[PDB]
Amino acid sequence: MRRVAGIVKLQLPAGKATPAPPVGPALGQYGANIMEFTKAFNAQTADKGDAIIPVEITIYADRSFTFITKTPPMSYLIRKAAGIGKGSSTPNKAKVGKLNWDQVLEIAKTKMPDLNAGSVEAAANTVAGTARSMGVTVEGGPNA
Amino acid sequence: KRTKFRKQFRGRMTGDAKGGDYVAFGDYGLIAMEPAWIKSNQIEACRIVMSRHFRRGGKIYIRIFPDKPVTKKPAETRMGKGKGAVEYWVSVVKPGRVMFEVAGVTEEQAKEAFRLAGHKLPIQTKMVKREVYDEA
Amino acid sequence: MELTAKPRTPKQKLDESMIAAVAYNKENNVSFALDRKAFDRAFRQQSTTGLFDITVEGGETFPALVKAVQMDKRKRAPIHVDFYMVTYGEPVEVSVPVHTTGRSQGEVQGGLVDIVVHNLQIVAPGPRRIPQELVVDVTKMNIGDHITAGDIKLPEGCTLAADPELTVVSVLPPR
RNA sequence: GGAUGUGUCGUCGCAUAGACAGCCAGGAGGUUGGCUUAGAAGCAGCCACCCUUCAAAGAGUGCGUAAUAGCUCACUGGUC
């Protein structure tokens, strides 16, 4: 309706058509099409399936929008790598499971335009951190 | 709060605090500064204050204890006919006596929980911290 | 530390910030009076297991340990001090502070480290070499776990005046 | 109970590795951390404070929002 641009950051579930609680009037109030984002982003969730892939949406004006689709949080595949579809009550009084150092190689290989880290140790231990306070116990470390 | 069985009535008098001026059972401690009487409910009040502020769980040592029966005559009676019948219970806290011990909490936490208890108290106080190894 | 006088009369020093004291050899016995400021810095540093050097305003300087301290109840400050004139090869019994080290695996599931007896009195070391602290590990300790006085690692030539099944540093449940 | 009133002592701390204040800028990527929730994403309530990049940036302090977003601090650099 005008020219008051904006760089808006959000997050939406991949394989769903969002109603009033997610989008609606959250980013459709800066000036962008919602009829061609239910046929745009919802077609790139056929790529990586079943997660909450974070999106960043920049709006120019008029009927313009440009978005970036990042990486699925494997907190849907660490709760799947155990047996509890909702996280631990506490991370240090009731654990979850135990992934591998090779289910870390799909974390820091989908997240390569993500973690500004360098070597494999850094890019592994970073999201070895996400799986710390989530509740789960880690398979590995030095030695052995 | 109350004692459980006893004799019944008492009296009143004062000088400085016998034992004990020293900090056992804990790391931080709260000390009287004035020759008061201290009622159950006043302690009860300090206990509940500090217990809340510490949340779970810390550790709270309520050193002082009300063994002294205070009485009050009925409403509108001419003096005599008897002695008043046990209104409530006091604990004769003399100066320097340590009323409170808390530990398992930071210095900050201790300060605060103390100050909060202090404002509920009939008398000025001071907090302090160990070294008083007269014995242990 | 450098006291000076020692008469039975206190007006010479009272306000001037000095503490009345006595140091006894067990054969030799001497009253006196130390600068407060000093003994404060000192006794804070070295505590009861102290050991420091005492040169009376007459030339003769002797080593000693702190045996008792007597306080103003209302001002909470030193007014008098009992001082043990150390020997050489065997002293007396030394009270020393139990400490605690490392994040215990008690404070991580519910409870907390509770030093049920702050000060442990041992028999002897050979005086020259007194333990000044006393580290106890607690990382193994769960909630409901008592540490008796036995299990304490003494530093060789040290024994235990304590009944060594008495509860010391114990970890308590929550609430 | 309170208070940068003013005198006097003492403690501790930071500073010729440049500080207190003032002024420019960054304030971070995992990560809406987990739990709860109709939503809680630093910020209504229960457990933990881990890695990445660096000269420096802490699951973080207050305001904020129904929840976002937003303003600012704890740290560092210049300035003096």
Swiss-Prot record, chain A:
CDD domains on file: Ribosomal_L11 (cd00349)
Q: Which UniProt keywords apply?
A: Methylation, Ribonucleoprotein, Ribosomal protein, RNA-binding, rRNA-binding
Q: Which InterPro entries match?
A: Ribosomal_uL11, Ribosomal_uL11_bac-typ, Ribosomal_uL11_C, Ribosomal_uL11_C_sf, Ribosomal_uL11_CS, Ribosomal_uL11_N, Ribosomal_uL11_N_sf
Question: Some GO term, biological process aspect, for this entry: which one?
Answer: translation
Role noted for this protein: Forms part of the ribosomal stalk which helps the ribosome interact with GTP-bound translation factors.
Q: Which HAMAP family match?
A: Ribosomal_uL11
What quaternary structure, including any partners, is listed in this protein's UniProt entry?
Part of the ribosomal stalk of the 50S ribosomal subunit. Interacts with L10 and the large rRNA to form the base of the stalk. L10 forms an elongated spine to which L12 dimers bind in a sequential fashion forming a multimeric L10(L12)X complex. Contacts the CTC protein (RL25).
The similarity annotation says:
Belongs to the universal ribosomal protein uL11 family.
Q: What is this protein called?
A: Large ribosomal subunit protein uL11
Source organism per UniProt:
Deinococcus radiodurans (strain ATCC 13939 / DSM 20539 / JCM 16871 / CCUG 27074 / LMG 4051 / NBRC 15346 / NCIMB 9279 / VKM B-1422 / R1)
UniProtKB/Swiss-Prot annotation, chain B:
The UniProt keywords, alphabetically, are: Ribonucleoprotein, Ribosomal protein, RNA-binding, rRNA-binding, tRNA-binding
Alphabetized GO MF terms: rRNA binding; structural constituent of ribosome; tRNA binding
Q: What is the top-level taxon of the source organism?
A: Bacteria
Against Gene3D superfamilies, the record matches this protein to: Ribosomal protein L10e/L16
Q: Would the keyword Signal be found if you checked this record's keyword annotation?
A: no
Q: Is the keyword RNA-binding assigned to this protein?
A: yes
GO cellular component terms attached to this protein's record: cytosolic large ribosomal subunit
Looking up Pfam families in the UniProt record yields: Ribosomal_L16
Concerning InterPro entries, the annotation shows: Ribosomal_uL16 (IPR047873), Ribosomal_uL16_bact-type (IPR000114), Ribosomal_uL16_CS (IPR020798), Ribosomal_uL16_dom (IPR016180), Ribosomal_uL16_sf (IPR036920)
**Self-association state and partner proteins as the record states:** Part of the 50S ribosomal subunit. Contacts the CTC protein (RL25).
Do you know which NCBIfam families this protein is assigned to? rplP_bact
Instruction: Please report which protein family the annotation says this sequence is part of.
Output: Belongs to the universal ribosomal protein uL16 family.
Q: What is this protein called?
A: Large ribosomal subunit protein uL16
Q: Which organism is it from?
A: Deinococcus radiodurans (strain ATCC 13939 / DSM 20539 / JCM 16871 / CCUG 27074 / LMG 4051 / NBRC 15346 / NCIMB 9279 / VKM B-1422 / R1)
The gene name on file is rplP
Curated annotation (Swiss-Prot), chain C:
**GO CC term (a single one):** cytosolic large ribosomal subunit
Q: Where do the record's region annotations for N-terminal domain lie?
A: 1-104
The protein's UniProt keywords, in alphabetical order, are: Ribonucleoprotein, Ribosomal protein, RNA-binding, rRNA-binding, tRNA-binding
Q: Tell me which domain of life the UniProt entry assigns to the organism this sequence originates from.
A: Bacteria
* Protein's UniProt keywords contain Lipid biosynthesis: no
Q: Does the keyword Ribosomal protein apply?
A: yes
The biological processes this protein is annotated with in GO are: translation
Where do the segments described as Middle domain lie?
105-175
Molecular functions (GO terms): 5S rRNA binding; structural constituent of ribosome; tRNA binding
Q: What does this protein do?
A: This is one of 3 proteins that mediate the attachment of the 5S rRNA onto the large ribosomal subunit. This protein has three domains. The N-terminal one is bound on the solvent face, the middle domain fills the space between the 5S rRNA and the L11 arm contacting the 23S rRNA while the C-terminal domain is on the edge of the intersubunit interface and contacts the A site. The protein conformation changes upon binding of a tRNA mimic to the A site, although the mimic does not interact directly with CTC itself, consistent with CTCs presumed role in moderating A site binding.
Entry's family note: Belongs to the bacterial ribosomal protein bL25 family. CTC subfamily.
Q: How does it assemble?
A: Part of the 50S ribosomal subunit. Contacts proteins L11 and L16, the A site tRNA, and the 5S and 23S rRNAs.
Entry protein name: Large ribosomal subunit protein bL25
Q: Which organism is it from?
A: Deinococcus radiodurans (strain ATCC 13939 / DSM 20539 / JCM 16871 / CCUG 27074 / LMG 4051 / NBRC 15346 / NCIMB 9279 / VKM B-1422 / R1)
Full protein stretch here: 1 to 175 of 237
